[PDB]
Design a protein around this nucleic acid. Structure first.
Ligand SMILES: [Mg+2]
Ligand SMILES: [Mg+2]
Ligand SMILES: [Mg+2]
Ligand SMILES: [Mg+2]
Ligand SMILES: [Mg+2]
Ligand SMILES: [Mg+2]
Ligand SMILES: [Mg+2]
Ligand SMILES: [Mg+2]
Ligand SMILES: [Mg+2]
Ligand SMILES: [Mg+2]
Ligand SMILES: [Mg+2]
Ligand SMILES: [Mg+2]
Ligand SMILES: [Mg+2]
Ligand SMILES: [Mg+2]
Ligand SMILES: [Mg+2]
Ligand SMILES: [Mg+2]
Ligand SMILES: [Mg+2]
Ligand SMILES: [Mg+2]
Ligand SMILES: [Mg+2]
Ligand SMILES: [Mg+2]
Ligand SMILES: [Mg+2]
Ligand SMILES: [Mg+2]
Ligand SMILES: [Mg+2]
Ligand SMILES: [Mg+2]
Ligand SMILES: [Mg+2]
Ligand SMILES: [Mg+2]
Ligand SMILES: [Mg+2]
Ligand SMILES: [Mg+2]
Ligand SMILES: [Mg+2]
Ligand SMILES: [Mg+2]
Ligand SMILES: [Mg+2]
Ligand SMILES: [Mg+2]
Ligand SMILES: [Mg+2]
Ligand SMILES: [Mg+2]
Ligand SMILES: [Mg+2]
Ligand SMILES: [Mg+2]
Ligand SMILES: [Mg+2]
Ligand SMILES: [Mg+2]
Ligand SMILES: [Mg+2]
Ligand SMILES: [Mg+2]
Ligand SMILES: [Mg+2]
Ligand SMILES: [Mg+2]
Ligand SMILES: [Mg+2]
Ligand SMILES: [Mg+2]
Ligand SMILES: [Mg+2]
Ligand SMILES: [Mg+2]
Ligand SMILES: [Mg+2]
Ligand SMILES: [Mg+2]
Ligand SMILES: [Mg+2]
Ligand SMILES: [Mg+2]
Ligand SMILES: [Mg+2]
Ligand SMILES: [Mg+2]
Ligand SMILES: [Mg+2]
Ligand SMILES: [Mg+2]
Ligand SMILES: [Mg+2]
Ligand SMILES: [Mg+2]
Ligand SMILES: [Mg+2]
Ligand SMILES: [Mg+2]
Ligand SMILES: [Mg+2]
Ligand SMILES: [Mg+2]
Ligand SMILES: [Mg+2]
Ligand SMILES: [Mg+2]
Ligand SMILES: [Mg+2]
Ligand SMILES: [Mg+2]
Ligand SMILES: [Mg+2]
Ligand SMILES: [Mg+2]
Ligand SMILES: [Mg+2]
Ligand SMILES: [Mg+2]
Ligand SMILES: [Mg+2]
Ligand SMILES: [Zn+2]
Lengths: 103, 144, 208, 159, 292
RNA sequence: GAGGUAAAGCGAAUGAUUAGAAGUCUUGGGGUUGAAAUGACCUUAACUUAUUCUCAAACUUUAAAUAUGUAAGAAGUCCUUGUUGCUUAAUUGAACGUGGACAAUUGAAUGAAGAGCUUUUAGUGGGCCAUUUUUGGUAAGCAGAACUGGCGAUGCGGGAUGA
RNA sequence: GGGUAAACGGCGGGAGUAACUAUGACUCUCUUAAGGUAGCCAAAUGCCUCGUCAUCUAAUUAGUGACGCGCAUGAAUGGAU
RNA sequence: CCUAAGGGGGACUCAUGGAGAACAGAAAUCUCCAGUAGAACAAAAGGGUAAAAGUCCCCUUGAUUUUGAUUUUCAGUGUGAAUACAAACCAUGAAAGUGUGGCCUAUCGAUCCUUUAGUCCCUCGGAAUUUGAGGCUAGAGGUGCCAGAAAAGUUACCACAGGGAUAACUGGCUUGUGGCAGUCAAGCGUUCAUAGCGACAUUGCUUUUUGAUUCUUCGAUGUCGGCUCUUCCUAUCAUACCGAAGCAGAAUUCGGUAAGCGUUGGAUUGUUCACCCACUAAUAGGGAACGUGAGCUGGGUUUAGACCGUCGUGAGACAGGUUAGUUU
RNA sequence: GGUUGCGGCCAUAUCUAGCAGAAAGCACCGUUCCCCGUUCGAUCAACCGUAGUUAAGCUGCUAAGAGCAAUACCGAGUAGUGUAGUGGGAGACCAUACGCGAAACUAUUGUGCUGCAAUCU
RNA sequence: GGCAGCUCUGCUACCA
């Protein structure tokens, strides 16, 4: 899958409310904070004796992930998110197909 | 089963009068393996109505023992007597529907003399079901 | 190897032919369907005799081969190899299946053999010959009947050879120039199409 | 493994008619549908948008909605022990006016015309349809038509 | 050696196209897109500006489609132009403009939208759409149907487009197919378009050819020579015609030298008639007999 | 209205398939011509043409029976003209209306211990058998589906006996 | 990174070849950490198997003695006596 | 899987065949004619498609935003997928139009938690500011047992609740397989189809084989074989009487009525089976809950001890071998 | 009646081989300054209607024409099928009773009809 | 998913 690094979609920002030029980037999940309430609760539950208190997922089945595009408006810097289908290979702004050539 | 219910034939040896059209003939064809029918004469109709004639009065089975019973229920259709009713059935009249529906289904006995050796095969093939066409009178004489 | 034929006598399954869906199917035992003087012209053999099925049934390719061989052997022995033209009129296109060659789990069988599905009144074998060779050809078919299961009738045809015309309509169309040879068969005149080609192909056509 | 996809089993239902493939004749696009019209549903295989499900192929219903290229049709489907009202969006290529309307709407006009004339003539007319009745008596002439006697024929083999 | 192709099975299974597709005259894809109307605008028709060019004529018709066949609203032909003062070049780009203006004015006369929606009375070649008047009926909307004719910038069909638009009809369009459109600099040079509207290209050809190849000028521009029409007075021929077209756009049918019955009787003499069944049967019998 | 099963068809498409016949080999070999000419001849095999025997659950032009959708009015039909920001070039339509006309043959049959509506809760969620259709299997008192009727849950007369 | 098997344990396949044939001392080839050594055996361990030969008997799927490409014998998981 | 293989527009016509053109030939490229699609359309198969949905070219991001309705599976719940609109904002085209991903039918995922985007809005409750945290709306990180626990073995030391819903006997249905018997008659038999046989086929019987099934029995019908004893069947090995021969005699072979009468002693093996030695008129085949264990015996199998080989890291396994093992 | 433009149904309209076509129309046809598109003004664009032609297109007619369409004392009330019996038959299957009812085949006939506008010997 | 060395080996980490 090859997706161009720019895109003109609708901007939901109050300033724009229209199709503007956007910059496309792949979304990357942030680092899990230690002070998130679910993390704070988990650490308290794990302390002391009792062993592992919550379940740990093992039976992985997916071999891909859904790629999310981060679209930042060049006018007002409002971001938007778009999930794509499951692809094993994804590049941003790769070389476009050239039809009519030999091996 | 639904066809026999719509002909008001919900027991064995129950008899009813039907006016022949395309619709009622195609009804009777469906019930043919379960019924014996034919063309009734005037004397057969008279004997049926006289001996086993009952009227549907307020959803009750009332004997036709007096002409006032017939008049109170069929005078708006110009039926004032048991003979008016017999005529209306026999010469299929403009008010055949009301007169035949007013008549409770006839509850006949078993034949005096029995049926043929095996009832449930067509009259043509030596049985009893289907259209026998003038021999319904002999059968009714046996059963009425 | 082969089960008794009683295991496959009746048309219990839908027709199961060779296709893109079953491919590893063996060949039928019968490969030759025309015997005797198959190149004889229509006028040489006026008499047709049929072996007709009185059964809705399945006949194995093995039985077809055996009956064909029996009839051919007898008729060539008694009257000569060129005194008749025998044709087998049923082709085994239905594949029989065998299971054993667990239990009932996964019991879909493998191809085992071939059979022809015949109806009542269906012709199994046809023999065109001369009239004087009737009793021989009949006796050739009557023996072949022993190789088949069920009931078969030997019926002398009303028609001229393997043609669809009676022995009288054929003579009428023959003396009227409406029949021409085509090798072992004939072509009949048509009153439709190009008039010139029709006239050229049937020069002796006494038009009315 | 069972397969129960949307268009399973529609191999022949959604086929075009023999020698009738290709472009749609434009009378299909010139018909006018109003709310309350009775329409037959027949999927056209060459238009895949707005296509009915295979259940509605061959069903007749009432138009309830009219859009740019489609009509909404109300269908009653049996689900267990009752009917459920189904609302199907269909492009007009899969829709045709039901010919049962035009016959009954003509009988309404004919009844109105017959009734008004009878009032003008001061007589009566009966407008209820009647089933076919048994035929009356008749006399069959045999001049040129003397009865020909037939017999069952003997058995013959024709092969 | 090879299989004969035109078998009876080939003919039996052949599905002939639509009659008017096999004639190569109707593009049914485009026709479906043009004709089909929004189903919630129930019986309101879509009106097409059918523009067709023959070798000698320009046909412009305003058409709405129905189940029994298309119905003409009005029609203007190029051979009507001599009535308005244009006698030669009845297939110019300018003749196309004149035909479009004529059909627009005639349609608006038929509807009653003459005083309202006059159009572009002073043709300067600027791109413009007929705007509706507030508190009044909307302009007659018409869609261009160029049929199988190719879309090129400078084509004559868009001459009828521009004429009809200037005549007061609302015909949706863009100016990037007009003569004088700069594709690199996406603006319309209205001077060159105005040149084309008033026969400027033809007049310039007359002037440029006269001083270079006089013999070809004598053959190509004969009618102008025997009409004493020079280049400088070419424009007025159109400029007056426009005015004349606006003065009386009503249709005047040609007075017919013969009646319908006379035409039919004359034409029926030159029409072979099918042989009776008996005639061809006798022919077959004779051909059989002469074969002996 | 819808359908593609039974049947039928295959000198109709696809696929399978028996036999000859007549042509072309110029883009098949063997032999015989040829001193060598690829230019003939005998042959088999190829194709081509018109025929011929036999077939298809996952082939088909055609195409049932049974089963199946809708309609058979008063919430209808017709006439006139009111509303809108929708729609039309519009005074066009769309939808919903005011007012007027059509009365029990108010628009097929037959039947109707009446129609409609609601709440709440039990048991059950092993099934089996018969006719017909039907799948696997050599078959099975075998395994699995379709429609109906039964047994289960049911005694009574008959089948000696028997869900 | 090194040591250690009287630690746990492990201890190979495919073709050709000698003035008949058979076998293969010999050679080639793949490959291991090493490729089962001394011994022993159809043994309480061998499937095929009631192995083959000898002896014992009139006759022995038993016994014993031989043989050994040993399904899957073998050295202090001790081998042979 | 695809930034096009999505969207719009335009132009063109495909597979293949024939006839022609230097090298060039069966296959290079060019030309004409024929060509209903016999091509192609990402991927299964089916449907669909010819001035296109196919091939090539031009422009693009509608594969966008907001939240409702509907179809399928359906409980008319969820998920997936799809349909027709409303309100925006766009692409494309002269335009009508078309476009809310892929021509259609598959290509996918809850609560809790985390993370990002949006609103920069609400809350941190004695009052504020700034960090931090918590909320609201939409995605993503995943459960493939796919309406979604967090999870290795062994038990031959074993336990419990049950199950004839279910295996290991007999019995019952069936008879493929096993066994036995016919019909036809190409051949064999010096000649000669049928004395004796008999291919290619085809019809049966039997329940002495083994399967198939799972109806009965799991609050138990004592599961191998032998010994002992009785009886029955006949598809007859012997004995009685006979018919046939490729019957000279003798011997033998084929067949009929026949179950009256008999059908053995041993070596090896737990064996059923087998295989030899020997006698004999003959050493036929079977059934009776695969007769027969409150009749026996207990060699085998199949509790617990123990050894070996192979397998396993191990506990242990072996339908492999071996030895000892309460018979009321 | 012919012809053109736009059509409806979408072969009774298609296909093959011949022949004819007055008037108008349509068509082929001529040219390259201009808008435009190509390897190629062949297609597409524009210009002239001037120099020519019915040769082709188009239209009609012909053919025991191919195909297609329709019809039927054609085949055939056949094949199939709903319902029934303590019908036949070891079975495979079959007959009968009350109903529905083909396809192929055969024969005959036909070979576009038509709406709006304009135009014409 | 973090470190680190030679497309990658080693160690460490594990609530959907
Ligand atoms: Mg703590
Ligand atoms: Mg804890
Ligand atoms: Mg701790
Ligand atoms: Mg008595
Ligand atoms: Mg009796
Ligand atoms: Mg079966
Ligand atoms: Mg199992
Ligand atoms: Mg269809
Ligand atoms: Mg789509
Ligand atoms: Mg177009
Ligand atoms: Mg079919
Ligand atoms: Mg089907
Ligand atoms: Mg069939
Ligand atoms: Mg057919
Ligand atoms: Mg075929
Ligand atoms: Mg409950
Ligand atoms: Mg429950
Ligand atoms: Mg159960
Ligand atoms: Mg119960
Ligand atoms: Mg009962
Ligand atoms: Mg009793
Ligand atoms: Mg009995
Ligand atoms: Mg060694
Ligand atoms: Mg050893
Ligand atoms: Mg041992
Ligand atoms: Mg001993
Ligand atoms: Mg020994
Ligand atoms: Mg030893
Ligand atoms: Mg070892
Ligand atoms: Mg050691
Ligand atoms: Mg060891
Ligand atoms: Mg694209
Ligand atoms: Mg695409
Ligand atoms: Mg296009
Ligand atoms: Mg739903
Ligand atoms: Mg859903
Ligand atoms: Mg799904
Ligand atoms: Mg637009
Ligand atoms: Mg849109
Ligand atoms: Mg959160
Ligand atoms: Mg507070
Ligand atoms: Mg506080
Ligand atoms: Mg998620
Ligand atoms: Mg998870
Ligand atoms: Mg689960
Ligand atoms: Mg689940
Ligand atoms: Mg445990
Ligand atoms: Mg164990
Ligand atoms: Mg059980
Ligand atoms: Mg058996
Ligand atoms: Mg058997
Ligand atoms: Mg056997
Ligand atoms: Mg011999
Ligand atoms: Mg059991
Ligand atoms: Mg038990
Ligand atoms: Mg006991
Ligand atoms: Mg006991
Ligand atoms: Mg005996
Ligand atoms: Mg004997
Ligand atoms: Mg005895
Ligand atoms: Mg012993
Ligand atoms: Mg037994
Ligand atoms: Mg026992
Ligand atoms: Mg005992
Ligand atoms: Mg005991
Ligand atoms: Mg023991
Ligand atoms: Mg033990
Ligand atoms: Mg080990
Ligand atoms: Mg002891
Ligand atoms: Zn913005």
């Amino acid at each position: 899958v090859n997706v161009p690094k720019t895109r003109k979609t609708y901007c939901k920002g109050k300033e724009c409310r229209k199709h503007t030029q956007h910059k496309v980037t792949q979304y990357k999940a942030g680092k899990a904070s230690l002070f998130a309430q679910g993390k704070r609760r988990y650490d308290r539950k794990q302390s002391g004796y009792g062993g592992q208190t919550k379940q740990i997922f093992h039976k992985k089945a997916k071999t891909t992930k859904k790629v999310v595009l981060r679209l930042e408006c060049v006018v007002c810097k409002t971001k938007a998110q778009l999930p794509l289908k499951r692809c094993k290979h994804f590049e941003l702004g790769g070389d476009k197909k050239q039809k009519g050539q030999a091996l | 089963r639904k066809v026999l219910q719509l002909l008001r034939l919900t027991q064995i040896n129950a008899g009813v009068f039907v006016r022949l059209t395309k619709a009622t003939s195609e009804l009777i064809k469906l019930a043919e393996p379960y019924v014996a029918y034919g063309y009734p004469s005037l004397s057969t109709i008279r004997q049926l109505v006289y001996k086993r004639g009952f009227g549907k009065v307020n959803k009750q089975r009332i004997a036709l023992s007096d002409n006032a019973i017939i008049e109170a229920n069929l005078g708006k259709f110009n039926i004032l007597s048991i003979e008016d009713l017999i005529h209306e059935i026999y010469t299929v009249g403009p008010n055949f529907k009301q007169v035949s529906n007013f008549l409770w289904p006839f509850k006949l006995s078993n034949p005096n003399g029995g049926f043929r050796a095996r009832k449930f095969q067509h009259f043509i093939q030596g049985g009893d079901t289907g259209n026998r066409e003038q021999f319904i009178n002999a059968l009714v004489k046996q059963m009425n | 190897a082969r089960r008794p034929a009683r295991c496959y006598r009746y048309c219990k399954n839908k027709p199961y032919p060779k296709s893109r869906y079953n491919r590893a199917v063996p060949d039928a035992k019968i490969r030759i369907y025309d015997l005797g003087r198959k190149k004889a012209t229509v006028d040489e053999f006026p008499l047709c005799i049929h072996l007709v099925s009185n059964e809705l049934e399945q006949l194995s390719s093995e039985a077809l081969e055996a009956a064909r061989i029996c009839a051919n052997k007898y008729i060539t022995k008694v009257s000569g190899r060129d005194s008749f033209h025998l044709r087998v009129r049923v082709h085994p296109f239905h594949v029989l299946r065998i299971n054993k060659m667990q239990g009932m789990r996964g019991a879909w069988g493998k191809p085992h053999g071939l059979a022809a599905r015949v109806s009542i009144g269906q012709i199994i074998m046809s023999a065109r010959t001369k009239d004087s060779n009737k009793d021989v050809v009949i006796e050739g078919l009557r023996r072949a009947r022993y190789k088949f299961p069920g009931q078969q009738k030997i019926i002398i045809s009303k028609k001229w050879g393997f043609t669809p015309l009676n022995r009288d309509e054929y003579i009428a169309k023959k003396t009227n120039g409406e029949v021409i040879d085509d090798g072992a068969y004939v072509k009949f005149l048509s009153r439709k199409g190009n008039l010139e080609a029709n006239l050229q192909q049937f020069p002796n056509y006494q038009y009315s | 493994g069972k397969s129960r996809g949307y268009r399973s089993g529609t191999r022949y239902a959604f086929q075009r008619d023999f020698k009738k493939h290709g472009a749609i004749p434009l009378s299909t696009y010139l018909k006018v549908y109003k709310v309350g019209d009775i329409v037959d549903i027949k999927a056209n295989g060459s238009i895949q948008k707005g296509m009915p499900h295979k259940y509605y192929h061959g069903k007749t219903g009432i138009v309830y909605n009219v859009t740019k290229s489609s009509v909404g049709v109300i269908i009653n489907k049996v689900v267990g022990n009752r009917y459920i009202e189904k609302r199907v969006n269909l492009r007009v290529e899969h829709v045709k006016h039901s010919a049962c309307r035009q016959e009954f709407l003509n009988r309404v006009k004919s009844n109105a015309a017959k009734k008004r004339e009878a009032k003008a003539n001061g007589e009566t007319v009966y407008l209820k349809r009647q089933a076919a009745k048994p035929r009356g008596s008749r006399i069959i002439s045999t001049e040129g038509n003397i009865p020909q006697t037939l017999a069952p024929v003997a058995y013959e083999t024709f092969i | 050696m090879q299989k004969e192709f035109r078998t009876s099975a080939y003919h039996s299974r052949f599905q002939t196209p639509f009659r008017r597709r096999q004639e190569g005259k109707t593009d049914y894809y485009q026709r479906k897109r043009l004709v089909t109307q929004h189903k919630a605008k129930y019986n309101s028709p879509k009106y097409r500006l059918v523009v067709r060019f023959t070798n000698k004529d320009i046909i412009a018709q305003i058409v709405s489609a129905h189940i029994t066949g298309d119905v003409v609203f009005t029609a203007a032909y190029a051979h009507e132009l001599p009535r308005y003062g244009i006698k030669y070049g009845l297939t110019n780009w300018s003749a196309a403009y004149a035909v479009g203006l004529l059909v627009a004015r005639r349609a608006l006369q038929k509807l009653g939208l003459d005083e309202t929606y006059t159009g572009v009375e002073e043709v300067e070649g600027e791109f413009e759409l007929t705007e509706a008047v507030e508190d009044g009926p909307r302009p007659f909307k018409v869609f261009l149907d160029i049929g199988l004719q190719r879309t090129t910038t400078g084509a004559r069909v868009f001459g009828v487009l521009k004429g009809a638009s200037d005549g007061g009809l609302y015909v949706p369009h863009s100016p990037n197919r007009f003569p004088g459109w700069d594709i690199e600099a996406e603006e319309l040079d209205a001077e060159l378009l105005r040149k084309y509207i008033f026969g400027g290209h033809v007049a310039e050809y007359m002037e440029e050819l006269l001083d270079d190849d006089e013999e070809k000028y004598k053959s190509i521009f004969k009618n102008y020579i025997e009409e004493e029409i020079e280049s400088e007075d070419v424009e007025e021929i159109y400029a007056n015609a426009h005015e004349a077209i606006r003065a009386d756009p009503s249709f005047k049918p040609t007075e017919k030298k013969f009646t319908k019955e006379q035409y039919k009787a004359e034409s029926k003499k030159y029409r072979q008639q099918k042989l009776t069944r008996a005639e061809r049967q006798a022919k077959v019998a004779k051909k059989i007999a002469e074969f002996k």
